[PDB]
Amino acid sequence: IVRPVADFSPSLWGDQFLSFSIKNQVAEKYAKEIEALKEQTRNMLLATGMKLADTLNLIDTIERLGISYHFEKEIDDILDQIYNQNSNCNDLCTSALQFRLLRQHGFNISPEIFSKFQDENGKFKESLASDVLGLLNLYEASHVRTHADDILEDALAFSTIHLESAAPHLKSPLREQVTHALEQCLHKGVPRVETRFFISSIYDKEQSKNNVLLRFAKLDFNLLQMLHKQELAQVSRWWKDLDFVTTLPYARDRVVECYFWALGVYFEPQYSQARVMLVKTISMISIVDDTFDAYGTVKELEAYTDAIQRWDINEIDRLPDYMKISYKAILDLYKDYEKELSSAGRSHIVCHAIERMKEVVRNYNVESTWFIEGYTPPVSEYLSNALATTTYYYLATTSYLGMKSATEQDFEWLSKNPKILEASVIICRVIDDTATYEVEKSRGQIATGIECCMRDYGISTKEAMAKFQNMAETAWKDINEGLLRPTPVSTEFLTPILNLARIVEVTYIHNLDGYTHPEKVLKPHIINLLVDSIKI
Template sequence: MEKQSLTIIGDEEVTVRKSSKFHPSIWGDYFIQNSSLSYAEESTQRMIKKVEELKVKVMSMFEETSDISQLMNLIDSIQMLGLDYHFENEIDKALRLIYEVDDKSYGLYETSLRFQLLRQHGYHVSAVICSKVFSLLSITDDIYDNYSTLEESTLLTEAIKRWNPQAVYCLPEYLKDYYLKLLMTCEEIEEELEPNEKYRMLYLQDEIKALAISYLEEAKWGIERHVPSLDEHLHNSLISSGCSAVPCVSYVGMGEVATKEVFDWHSSFPKAVEACCVIGRLLNDIRSHELEQGRDHTASTVESYMKDHDTDAKVACKKLREIVEKAWKDLNKESLNPTKVPRLIIERIVNFSRSMEEIYKYNDMYTNSDTKMKDNISLVLVESFPV
């Protein structure tokens, strides 16, 4: 029996959809209505002027610094502040000098710093790519999880598998804009890539297709009231966690460091990626278990463990946390040992796993954003940075 059903109202059939009681956006139209910002226009202009003055001052530091050690420390400091995107040309020019220098007289600190910076050469994180794509993946999850009927989910999955604008005509009206936006976003990203980098989008498309297939499988579980075994659940839900897709998205904008070998490695679902998916999936399920029991939802790994071992939720959550700890050990081991890919790629996976710990450590801050998540976003996007 579908969780969505057709109800006759008058002479018309009306689709009755699932309804999840998520709280409305805590930001309202804050980020849309710029005129509603509390700070005065005059203060904003002063801040902009001060920022420009400081940028000129930092640029002059690049020109005036002849000592290579000082230059490396300058670049390192700028990167740790997250301001390197303002000085890409200056940093690239300085890195060429650092590469050519004779480092035989360097101590351990200078040698390691030089190595770190040179390994980062050509690495340009694309925040736009991560945010266009990540937002769309979040919407995709909500469509399957909270809104579409099984028939609509099946049609959407087939359209995503086809990855062709013509497939839009098979979709219900409300999904057409979303589907075309998904394809258009990926096309726009591809246009930003160098000719020898465009192949990367095929790997990203495969990740999105795999997500859609796994979302559909979970939708079927929910409708059939099926509680799979833990192994069966993880076989599908490690993919539906999105923790494989998101790092892959980040590779797309990583310049020369993200080679075809990196994408082949990632698509083979290596131990590091598997560990990241285990961490994200189980932490999510443990924190959201109580919330999701209050609404019609697909069984989580908590229910699967309870069924497998005939135990209660408290014991199941404890055992799942032990699996998370093992996954962290696996990920740490992969980080310390030589791998087939550059360390920057492993760091991308480790940092994303850390973000999952932060989001789900004490609460489900992804769903309940009126928490520390609000403070984190505010610190980055709302509050003025002292200059």
């Protein structure tokens, strides 16, 4: 059997993450100071007699600085007061911020707050074109709409063209903030990534900055980074002791990138165990993907798929030696999860992730059959298979394993493919397809998303990529709707799904496969989050 030639890049990190020794002296000092700063900041929030605009800017700044996870109760109480009092008597920048903050937190504030900023025709008054802070906040708000917000249909175009016009002549750091916003809006960005930029590039350089908030944000970010580095070291050692880098040379060596994914899903300390479980799953399923995509024969893939369905170590002998390596590693991993969850009596929930993995592999095999037969399915049939092969139903289910408060009813809800999960999956599917279209087309993949779309509807590549763009936009509106109260499960279990959608946007920014080619997109993010501390 002549296998295809290896074409992937090696890990660009080597062993620089393998050993990290925390400095307990520094960490304990940081934490001791943070406690003091945390309380000063709390008192800023609970301060009475604040104006609406000041209150919203405080909350907004604390969220962008990445320290709002300390104040979820206080921020919620305040936004709930604002929601229920109905203040319709403000300028564009306060109104747009009010809208965004409330919607992001699930409060269904009416989009009619914007009608006073539009003419009889529902288009924004062009007299607002000289209000840069108004335009910036309108811009950020435009990314949070649902299907019920067509009054905002013009907001993105309007704010974008006038921010571009104004940008070159703005003072710093406002100019940099506007320029950054036009490249990456806040709502669709990975939170740690946006936080790092905000602290270091914007707030640190604001003439008006609050010194207590800035120091708090820097210390907290650097302290959490220490934890992230310990987790990455622990995960790097686990990966090294599996040694797929040499026993399975056909596969992408990307455990750091996988960690960045898990860090994107949640960054907070209480999700430390959840992050480590998640990244191990991402790494492992990525090995299975490459086995199907760039190494295994049709016959070998069949045995592998069936062994996975039966899920039994007795089945290894049906497999070629190299497949025994991945298969035992997979079964062992899930036995590890089971033991790791035994202490809390949550072992039984592991079977939910296992059934989602079986689903991914069945659909991998189908995709392989299609490729060999040269089948180009209709879009409907294509998606019925290719949605699961994003792995996103599987990763979402996996993200719950290490979350201490996840109950069986939470898994029961997820298992029904609720709309917010379906939307996140769809976003990953159509963006990946738009980006990897050309590459897969050159490798003989006639069953690629865009191709199925072109053939089905009888339309050009351009028209099909536009249709996929529309599906992404529709899905973002569904994600935004799915955050609105009353939520079907706790918000804590929605945020990982939202964050998975965000990781897509960030990873495939400017239409490139950032996981396969980490050097362009992911490398600076990894350095900013996991190598370089913010200088105080």
